Amino acid sequence: MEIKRFGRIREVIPLPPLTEIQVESYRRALQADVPPEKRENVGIQAAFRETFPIEEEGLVLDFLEYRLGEPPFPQDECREKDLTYQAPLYARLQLIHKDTGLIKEDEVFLGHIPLMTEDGSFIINGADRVIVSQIHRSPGVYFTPDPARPGRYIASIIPLPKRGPWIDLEVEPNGVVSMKVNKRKFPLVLLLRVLGYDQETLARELGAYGELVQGLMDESVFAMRPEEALIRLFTLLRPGDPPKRDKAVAYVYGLIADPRRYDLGEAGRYKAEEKLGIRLSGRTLARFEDGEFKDEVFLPTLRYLFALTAGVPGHEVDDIDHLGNRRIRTVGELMTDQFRVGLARLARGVRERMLMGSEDSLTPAKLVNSRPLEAAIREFFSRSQLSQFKDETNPLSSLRHKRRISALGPGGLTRERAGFDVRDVHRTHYGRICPVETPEGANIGLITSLAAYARVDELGFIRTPYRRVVGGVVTDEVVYMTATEEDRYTIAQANTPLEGNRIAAERVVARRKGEPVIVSPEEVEFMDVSPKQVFSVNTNLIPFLEHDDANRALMGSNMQTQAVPLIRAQAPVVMTGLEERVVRDSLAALYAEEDGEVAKVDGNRIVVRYEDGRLVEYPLRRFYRSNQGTALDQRPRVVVGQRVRKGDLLADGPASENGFLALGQNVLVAIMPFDGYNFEDAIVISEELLKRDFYTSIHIERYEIEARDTKLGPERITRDIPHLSEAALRDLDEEGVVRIGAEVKPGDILVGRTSFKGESEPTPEERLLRSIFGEKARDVKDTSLRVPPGEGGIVVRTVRLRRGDPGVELKPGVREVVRVYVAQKRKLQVGDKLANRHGNKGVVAKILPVEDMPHLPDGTPVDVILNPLGVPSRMNLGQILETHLGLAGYFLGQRYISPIFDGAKEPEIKELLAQAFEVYFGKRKGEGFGVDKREVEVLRRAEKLGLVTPGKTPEEQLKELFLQGKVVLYDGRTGEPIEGPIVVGQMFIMKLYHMVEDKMHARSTGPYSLITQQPLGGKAQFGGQRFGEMEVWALEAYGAAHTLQEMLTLKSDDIEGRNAAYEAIIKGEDVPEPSVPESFRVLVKELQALALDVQTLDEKDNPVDIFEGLASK
Amino acid sequence: YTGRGLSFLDLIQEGNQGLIRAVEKFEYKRRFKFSTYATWWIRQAINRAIADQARTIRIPVHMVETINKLSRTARQLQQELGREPTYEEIAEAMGPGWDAKRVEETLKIAQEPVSLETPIGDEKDSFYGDFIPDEHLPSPVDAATQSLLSEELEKALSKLSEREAMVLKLRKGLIDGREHTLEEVGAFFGVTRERIRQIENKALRKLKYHESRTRKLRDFLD
């Protein structure tokens, strides 16, 4: 299967490491490789240098250096034992007695820092988790126009999230500038006087403007001394507190001058310098030195605001939604922030501990309490919104999840607090954030995916690469630039024709400040690297993207994530070229480090002899259960003695074929309605797919049980379960666990557990029964683990962890835990959801035999039948072109790589189809067969429809039909041909994770809630279906009063009513009349608890007791 | 003392109670300032209030001190060893009379109850109480099988004589009361204990014979 590549755009640079956004940021944060003396003031090192030294105010706790030890357990051990993959963090601290002049130095153990795996995901509590980058407003100074009053602007000073209050500066109608902090508004003149500014300085600096400077001059504040002005400012900010100079200056310093409490940030400082044209010494609004306050940013901000109000040419407002004004916090920044919070708590504990208790005899180890830091870190890595449970259905799933950017999370936007402004695709999203890919629904526009070529810079601003164009020739120099820098140049398009390096087109389509323009080659300053940089990883994997509507390409890209690995997965016929890169960068496959020869090949491990001679053994991950239940296995693709070059493939990862991403099957697809089984996106498949095991996956389910200690006695996991026959215990071994390899069905026992019964006398009927049968009641009862309905399979693994095992930290009171991994081989069935890369999705509605599917004149039946009516409404024409190219490849025996927006076009597909028809019909001519009568009738009908040129021979008409992508398709039932030619091709169809087997649920009676006594919800808990308000409204509209009453009382919460109804049904009688629900009783009791007398009356207004006298004294 | 399970104002009020006690017990003859003596009582009252009111399930002060000492020892061993200590090391460091089992039980006791309204998920539409079944009230299946067992037992007892059935119901609590002893039933019927036992055994044997010949009552035994 030779690969033919289309396209004329030559990329000067390759795709950057797709996981670098997660990996490089955490490497910068930890700095575990750089020696401590060479560490820069970033990340947790910056946090240490910020919080430390701690001063009692003569005891000083200073920090010298920190180191990270080797992790106690490897990744596999942490996953198996449900541990957290982390490295021990120790800090070196010194205690200095200022009065005494003695130093005590020792290394204190601060705790454990979770480590990142090579793929970019953490292992928290044995579960793979991914930290999602958060997009937020970049700190700095912005100038937004006031919407309430036209012609006026308001200045906003934004620090880092939870690192200071937002400052507002506004021009009041009176002409006096107002500063707003923490919802409190006051005259800015007071705080400006606190910074030691005189009338002459303000007159000389801000006087070259309108009446704003005159309004800024209030002799009441200017005549006031800076100390009295500071006291008045403190009184205005915090009323009631006594005016004290020390407290006032401390509060002001902590509000606008304390680096530990106020942090504008590196990005904020850079933005302030870029906008206001100043050089901030630090990252604070004001500087407290020599016992006095010095201005840093307030005066330049006020000057810029006054100039913008006046209307100077060089100053303009700032766009809040501009992607240059919006930055990204990766895993490193969030982890550093949480570490800083924990370290601040630790410093507070040290300070409150170092001033009390044996001050002379102190050591840094005793003072330092590391519990708050570890608590904050574990809270961030477990219970944070941005720390999401890893989606690893396929390597592409994890790859996208690591590259996701979420506007939600702690300190960010909210799902229902977000308007259209944040959800729209700004003009600066070009080449930095994927426009099409986003989760549709309530989270559309709030979660996005990073572009393919985009990379987050040091400050957190997304950059995109552009080729420098000078003198009309495009050079190989590539500049990674942000949106604010991008807005200053005219950037051409990657599809502009080039005569080598010189631009050939006289009229070049370019972008100026985000708007499309037509310019000359001389005016071109930058060029796009490639069309791929605009779209993310998923969208770059959709061939013929230019022919798909954005709303449907969104669905296609999203569903590419949900495709499950298949035991016979094969790469698509029509590719875009990123499959190999996705597989390589997802770290799912196995590749040789350098040149060498493979010495041993096995299903479990591969031993390779490199050129230097060293033996390297790579274990093969075999049938490991992913987070989503899919089976992730690596299959060797080499043989003993085979020589491999550096970077060559050694073992295919999950959902991969020879290093190419294989999320589905290449199946013969015919586009035609079929007996209504294609109705409303439904898909018809052939039984031939099941015969040769296509769309067949492996799913592993984990069932966990725990034997604990109980006051009644310790629960024992044993094979001897009381009142059970030998048939039920056939599969259980001597230890009470199901033997490995046994087939389990719903209701079968996986592990046997007996629990001591609560000491309570039995009901008299049971006692009489026991006396009649002479069977003494045992002291234990069956509490074993059984397969839930709708599940089962083959037991493939049993893990038994016991208390006292090395590294197994069981919860207190739990003797042991048993986990059973049961694997089932799922085949395609009716109700399973299939899809394709172009967003065409549907559930399999019929599985026809091979003899019923339409077949080609050569006898080849089609495998999948698609409804054509899904094309015109969804406007996803790319699937048609993929079908044509797949037909050409199927009859030519080759695969194609057509990159998005630069690849296969209509003439190329037509000539490929011409070659395919040439070989296809030459084979028939050589076999000695002419033209079918049915083919002749179809050709006549087609020429009546204008599809083929009249007067040509049947061979020429058939060739024309093939060039149109249509073939004469016969009917498998009647044998007569389909009256019109049918588009038949080879299309790549994925099997999605949504399967009817895991979604079907039913329930008659089961668990009920605690308070309302209503049935629970969810298939896992065996709950009922929610009959919400809208269903009740529908029942009322039908007027089904009795059905609604039943669904409200008999089937939901009428305890006596439901018990009597069940007893009547099992006795063959009709259910009785329902009674008052328990929910209304809860309502009445809660209203009474609110001191409201709710009484139910009758026709004569007499009270009616709905509690049957149980609540009456 | 803030952040130890009680709000700031509650700590202030308990310290006020301790201050009142200190004023009651303060002596100025010793020439010590009031702050020195009052601090002891204030911190004692605050600590007692934290021990007695910072947990939903109250724990005695001695057990609270034991838990605090265990936590301090565990923290010291954790910082000394650079890892989380096992129960054996903690028990060894605590002192005599402590083993791994006692440490595990103390840690189990020190487990604060979990709130029933803690949300799970990005959306605030789920709670713990939605996943905890009610295992107190009988299920409809349990009530149905209890009624079926009662009906089958009543039908089976019809084969017995009038006196034997009454004796068996009295002796097995079928009259909703506690199982009457042999002497009680005998006095009720004016018969001696031995004859009551004999007739009860004979009726039980007859019921066993009927069940063997019918096998319409075995399924309810479980």
Binding site: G240, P242 | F8, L9, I12
Partner: peptide, 14 residues
């Protein structure tokens, strides 16, 4: 007024 601690501190400051 809205903060009970503030009101209590003001009361004890008298």
């Amino acid at each position: 007024t809205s903060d009970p601690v503030r009101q209590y501190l003001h009361e004890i400051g008298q």
